[PDB]
């Protein structure tokens, strides 16, 4: 399961996995906002490539 995969990647950079399980919804919201910002900067800017 995907949150268990994210918990052991957090463990790979030296954070304990309870930090992820206790902040799971904040972390998923920050990810969804960052994807939306990538999409806006590609959808209106014309020198990126």
């Amino acid at each position: 399961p995907f949150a268990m995969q994210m918990a052991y990647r957090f463990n790979g950079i030296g954070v304990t996995q309870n930090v992820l399980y206790e902040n799971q919804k904040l972390i998923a919201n920050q990810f969804n906002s960052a994807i939306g910002k990538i999409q806006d900067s590609l959808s209106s800017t014309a020198s990126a490539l």
Partner: protein, 55 residues
């Protein structure tokens, strides 16, 4: 490692080779309350000195 269930009983194992052990307080660590983890499960954590020492 990871908590796994064989259908009836809960164990802890390493991720790349299957070798199930009893969940004790040397296998695990405590942090926080049971209401902030999505998907937590009710089970017992055995204390490894209560049969060997009650002197």
């Amino acid at each position: 490692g990871v908590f796994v269930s064989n259908g009836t009983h809960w164990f802890v194992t390493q991720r790349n080779f299957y070798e199930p052990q009893i969940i004790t307080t040397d296998n695990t660590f405590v942090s926080g309350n049971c209401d902030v983890v999505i998907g937590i499960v009710n089970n017992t954590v055995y204390d490894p000195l209560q049969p060997e020492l009650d002197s």
